[PDB]
Amino acid sequence: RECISIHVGQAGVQIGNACWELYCLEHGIQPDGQMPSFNTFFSETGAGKHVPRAVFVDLEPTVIDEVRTGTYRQLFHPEQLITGKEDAANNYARGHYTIGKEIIDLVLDRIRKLADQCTGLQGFSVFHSFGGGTGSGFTSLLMERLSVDYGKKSKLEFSIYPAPQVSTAVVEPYNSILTTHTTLEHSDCAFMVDNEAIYDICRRNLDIERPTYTNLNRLIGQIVSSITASLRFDGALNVDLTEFQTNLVPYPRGHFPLATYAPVISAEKAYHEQLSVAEITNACFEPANQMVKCDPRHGKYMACCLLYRGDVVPKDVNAAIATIKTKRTIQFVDWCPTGFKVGINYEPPTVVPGGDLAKVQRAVCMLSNTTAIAEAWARLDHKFDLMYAKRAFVHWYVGEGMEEGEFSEAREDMAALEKDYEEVGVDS
Amino acid sequence: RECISIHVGQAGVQIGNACWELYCLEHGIQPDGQMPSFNTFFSETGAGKHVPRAVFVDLEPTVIDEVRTGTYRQLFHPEQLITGKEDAANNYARGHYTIGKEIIDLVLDRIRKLADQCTGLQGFSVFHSFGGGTGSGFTSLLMERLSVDYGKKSKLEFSIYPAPQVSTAVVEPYNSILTTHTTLEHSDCAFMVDNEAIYDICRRNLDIERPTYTNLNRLIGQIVSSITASLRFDGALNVDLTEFQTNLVPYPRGHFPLATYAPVISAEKAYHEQLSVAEITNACFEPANQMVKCDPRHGKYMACCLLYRGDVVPKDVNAAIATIKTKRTIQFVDWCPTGFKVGINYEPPTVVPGGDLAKVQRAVCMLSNTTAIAEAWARLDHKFDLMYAKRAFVHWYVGEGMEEGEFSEAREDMAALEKDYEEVGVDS
Amino acid sequence: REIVHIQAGQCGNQIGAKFWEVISDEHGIDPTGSYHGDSDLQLERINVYYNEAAGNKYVPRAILVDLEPGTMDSVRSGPFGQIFRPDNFVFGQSGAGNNWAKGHYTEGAELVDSVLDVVRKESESCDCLQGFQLTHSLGGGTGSGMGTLLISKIREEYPDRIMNTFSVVPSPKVSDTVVEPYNATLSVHQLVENTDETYCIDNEALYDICFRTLKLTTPTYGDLNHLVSATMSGVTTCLRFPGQLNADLRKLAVNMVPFPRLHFFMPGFAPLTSRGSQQYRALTVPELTQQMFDAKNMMAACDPRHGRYLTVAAVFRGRMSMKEVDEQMLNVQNKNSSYFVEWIPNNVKTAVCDIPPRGLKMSATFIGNSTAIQELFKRISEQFTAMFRRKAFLHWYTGEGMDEMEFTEAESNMNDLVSEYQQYQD
Amino acid sequence: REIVHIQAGQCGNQIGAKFWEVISDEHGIDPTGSYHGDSDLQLERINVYYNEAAGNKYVPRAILVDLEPGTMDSVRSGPFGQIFRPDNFVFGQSGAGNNWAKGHYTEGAELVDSVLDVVRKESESCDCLQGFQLTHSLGGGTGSGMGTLLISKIREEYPDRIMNTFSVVPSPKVSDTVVEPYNATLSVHQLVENTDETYCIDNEALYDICFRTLKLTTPTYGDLNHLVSATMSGVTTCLRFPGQLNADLRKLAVNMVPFPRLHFFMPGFAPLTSRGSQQYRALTVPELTQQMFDAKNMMAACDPRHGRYLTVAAVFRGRMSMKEVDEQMLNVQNKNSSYFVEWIPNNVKTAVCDIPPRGLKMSATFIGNSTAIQELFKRISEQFTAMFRRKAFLHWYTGEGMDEMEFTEAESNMNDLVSEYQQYQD
């Protein structure tokens, strides 16, 4: 019941940096690899050194070099640090093919090595952005090959959603749309997260004046471990990744649950506050704590899963659920009666030294399949239209070999996706 | 149950260099001869020094001098290092007669000395190229004399097959064809190996950018010890050289089994991989792992023998065989029902310090008599035709005393050989 | 005379944890398995639930099963984990995600075959099985899914043994998952054909008991599952200890099931009140019968007085007279005759045994079979139809391979059960 | 009463290693050869398999033979290598390469003459030989080749002694060498004329037993060869220890061979199930007979129910009543009469002895002779013809000097055996 973590691009790697740091914090792992104690993510060598089961890929050396110069470079095996010599210029054409195609075989074989190291691989998780090159384009290439050799193993993807505020590439819509299609084709579950919503949480609930990616990544990393580490460690009601597939995807296409997380409270505001299971879950149904820029009250629910860490009793959860059903404004779709899944571990939430969040006694992760996701898609469609109407910058992809129809096609596929969410939301 | 190794030419000697190095590695032999521990290949002196039972011949001092200056020069007895003063100019006429004829008597008597040293000689193995002078021509001369005095002892020959890529002599076809005939006349089993196929394996399975002969020889040497050392050391199902004669040659002429070997995997790719007996044997039936440039799927099988090292159970082999029979595309010829011979030793595969292959727990050598060998012969016939059509370079042999009809004759003999393989492949 | 118990899912695991705790208390068995009892009778029928291990140590005849290691480990870490043998821990590593299709139909089936082999092993060690007891949820993936698979296989192998199960019933105020009605419907469909009886306990009602009568401000599952275990142990007290009436579960089944398909029961319990008032209590049989009749002390979320009774079973523990019990329970029927169905003269049956629960002088367990129960099925079926009509979340089960008609037929059978209660109602 | 055992090839060497381990366990013989038993009976017939060496040490009456030193050395390095005398290690130095022609026809013959002299020495040390036992493969060069040469020479010298052999049968899922069918055919051809009986065990079936019934995730030869040794020791338990019925192997031969050429047997074994379920087991004779009849507990890869039985031998170990065994085995025939051939009333014969296997209260070994066996011969003959027709690899045997007609006739005799099973089948 092991897994592999794949980090592509700076978005994937920098997030990964916090993720593995967190895993060290969860089990008392020293940077040197020495750890006296997580076998799902680490393998052990005869030296008593543990090695992260992960692959870090960046087509430009720069970020990988950062890894190589950091403290955890002694944790990572040199073969897991793979780099190219030039980026994709924020461009899928290069990421997916022109450049990335020259490295991907190395990458896949290192994955195989790890796959052979694992005895019972449940699956793997991938981190990347939607708008980058390496992070999007290369990622697409990668998933094409992984679904060939692994197939059936869990394909979890964590994708960064381009915000209107932050925008670092003018052709991000194009990059994102191309990517999206391929993730529809090969992922099992995609989680897109909006840095702009996260910033909002950090400035209001963590009270942070000036959020950076380093703080943003800490938040995300903890959420990801609450989903996985928490499954590995055992608790009361353990919930496997295969159960998430089974329970969260009603139709082959609706594989886009979103995440909301609480408690996200600064130490200073946590004093004085004690949240019950019910109260934390009430925070989880608030749009203001949503890690994606959309409105949960607008959309309808199809699936919802709550995962618990630390001090939680099933009974309290049962009461909390009743409250959500009655309080809310949780319009669930007829197609799914009641769909709330509950996983409860005993493992307590962990705290990062030099962190920005309070120590908490219980924590809740909300995963949910809601029709509000279409909203985000609509925003991207529009942006595409504008760029594509003029065909500004199109030569940067076409000149690398892309076909006009390929862009049309991908957009259309997203339009279909959104329409499918509409359809499922239509009660029947 | 002892043997003698004869190395002629640089091809034979350089391969031999790795072979004896490997034998040292197999039994912990120091370069000085001191060894605390292989009596089939070594004799022991009262000093506790062991001496390789082999003869190294090179008509040009150069390569032998290399041997003489290397570390294993203390292992080799000076009388076993025989050299001339001029090469054969890549030419059988000189190798076989003009020059080589002046040294061969020395050589044979040193062989006799070793033959008298052995108590129960099973036979001997010879290493050389098909295209060289000394390696081909001299070799022919040698076999003419050895079959006189030894007769019945095993005559195993390992011949390097000229690749289209590497070609170092324009009259290689001529050299090769002349040689071939004589090997047909006096060898018991000839194994031809194509450096170009080997390179392909090294670049893909060993992942080597730039293969050299030193790496190529390591691979071959290990295969050869897997055939012989493995017989000497005893295992479960020991298989003698005489059994190979009995089982691999259906008719007096079909003495050309080819070799395929697996696992041929780099350390880096071996992590993560574990191959079962069946899996390794599946690699052995893949053309991509074939050490000869031909297509095993094209030809038919007549005989096949699998030798195992290390951790192998007969039962697993039995299952593997069923798999080959059922999976494959192993069209066996009616003339031989089922012909699979299995030899299983306990001796584990060995690793060369500073090697290029992973440490493996089990290893498989595939010997096989297939009709695909004709393919290679066809290529040589054609090349001959071209040269002979013009009669380019013919004076370099004729001027040394060769007869035109001799070349015609030898070609024709090869044509007959290929036709005989056809005939055997015809089911009846 | 022996019973094999199986704990499926967290519910099953935790309720059963309390159950086995109680049963060992009943017999003087410490957490190591060693017997240090008080009476000979504690050993005399210890075989129903235990194997005697070398050294006068006992092993509970029960299998712990789940798809999540953590739960299993948490149970094993507590007292009474030590009493269980490693052989009874069967589990996977990935929950079902609350999906009956994953538990019943796919993944859980993979473990079920190994569970059944352990079951068989235990039934072979037994002299004569009386029956099987399962503890599970009606809404969870392994509790309702895996567990129902297991049941179909056990009943198949042992047609004449008593299959009973205790299970947690969804409520509007409890509901966690949107597909909980879907899981419930599918399990009900199977349980109605494959069990001899099932007890319907609702956490909602249990919470009310805890606060209202037990005066607890923070009801926890640790206490809620305690109340369930009280009733679970109550039903085999007579089986395990000498008494006067109805010890056998089969006898109870005969008297409690008037029609093959109506086998759902309403458990309740007396005395059930906080300590504050206990100093003013005076337990008598009338006192116990007052509390057992009163709907507020029912563990099922359903008021019997809204429907009509087909059968009532009352089990008494401790030394009470025959007259007192039989007169008073007759009087219950006499005084509340309007809530009983006229088909059965003497609707109330009693069991009386001589061994009281530790800490009480007397106690009584209530088992009802009233047509009021249909309300619980209405809650489920209704919620189901809303989801089902739109097919919300259905794709998660169709992903496993479940057919819309599988669910349709499941509903149909639920509707049948309600209609049959109505046919008997009046 | 004595038996000389010979181990040929790795198969023979490793299976026999387990066999001798077990036999010494049977008699309380430690790895040094010293007797530390439990009973007098352990010594009372120790002579069948052992010589008493000075100091109350025993030496196994058996010869270890191969062409590869390494194997022989690995056996000698383990427990029980010490119990063997140096005189029984006969080996060469170059395997046969899986070539029957090298093993039987050429090279192996060279050692066989020295083996036979050791055999003769041992038969001279014996008071009265009962017979010979060989353990070998049907597909290997020394196992089938050398071993069959040895057999022709032994039977020649001892016509009235029982020649039996245990041998590993090729399967489509096992097959290692392409010429394995060639080796098998040639050995079969000889074995059918030169042995009194041979047991056909297939690793495929053994793997299924290990996982399916024994619940092992990693079947190894160490355990697979263990199962074989169980059956090998079973057949001489009565010979070695007092009992009631059929101790002698010849008696068994008389009852198991209706026709001179049909002497291939299907061994099986009970009880054969993992520990997990053992706590629920209750061994009775019906229980043992259920497991022995069930094809899944056969060691041969062949389901008897596909064909029809000519003979059944069941050997029981441990204290069982006469009635129980004879009634129940009669009932097997009665209940499954459709799978027995009507020529023989009372197809099931039993042997019963009083000494159980260490660790079990009772045990039973199954020997079947059913026409279903022909399927194994079909697998071999078919594969053979495909190779033979094209002469693939034949040159390796013609290199030794084997004639196409030698193989042709070998096939012919295999075809005869199948036809004879069909003649008796129905």
Ligand SMILES: Nc1nc2c(ncn2[C@@H]2O[C@H](COP(=O)(O)CP(=O)(O)OP(=O)(O)O)[C@@H](O)[C@H]2O)c(=O)[nH]1
């Ligand atoms: N149940 C078992 N079958 C085995 C074992 N070893 C091998 N075999 C089976 O036996 C056949 C291969 O034979 P061996 O090891 O006995 C060959 P042998 O050593 O007799 O002769 P050579 O040709 O000289 O190697 C084949 O069906 C293997 O699959 C074992 O340990 N157990």
Ligand SMILES: Nc1nc2c(ncn2[C@@H]2O[C@H](COP(=O)(O)CP(=O)(O)OP(=O)(O)O)[C@@H](O)[C@H]2O)c(=O)[nH]1
């Ligand atoms: N009285 C109690 N009800 C419980 C308890 N735990 C859970 N439940 C109830 O059971 C249902 C949820 O089920 P579980 O924990 O049993 C699910 P289970 O672990 O069987 O399967 P998975 O889908 O594989 O997680 C629901 O009605 C919860 O509200 C408990 O400890 N006590």
Ligand SMILES: Nc1nc2c(ncn2[C@@H]2O[C@H](COP(=O)(O)OP(=O)(O)OP(=O)(O)O)[C@@H](O)[C@H]2O)c(=O)[nH]1
């Ligand atoms: N949460 C989070 N988002 C990040 C981080 N780094 C970058 N991003 C976001 O991811 C996108 C940036 O992708 P880039 O860094 O340009 O590119 P890349 O995906 O690494 O690959 P290339 O374009 O080839 O360099 C933007 O939308 C950023 O806001 C990070 O550390 N954390």
Ligand SMILES: Nc1nc2c(ncn2[C@@H]2O[C@H](COP(=O)(O)OP(=O)(O)OP(=O)(O)O)[C@@H](O)[C@H]2O)c(=O)[nH]1
């Ligand atoms: N595998 C392998 N092939 C070699 C090696 N050395 C040479 N060859 C091949 O053998 C042939 C070369 O033969 P030469 O070295 O020219 O000649 P020779 O056979 O030593 O004898 P002369 O012609 O008289 O020098 C070519 O086809 C080479 O590719 C070696 O070390 N390993």
Ligand SMILES: [Mg+2]
């Ligand atoms: Mg970058």
Ligand SMILES: [Mg+2]
């Ligand atoms: Mg659970």
Ligand SMILES: [Mg+2]
């Ligand atoms: Mg040279």
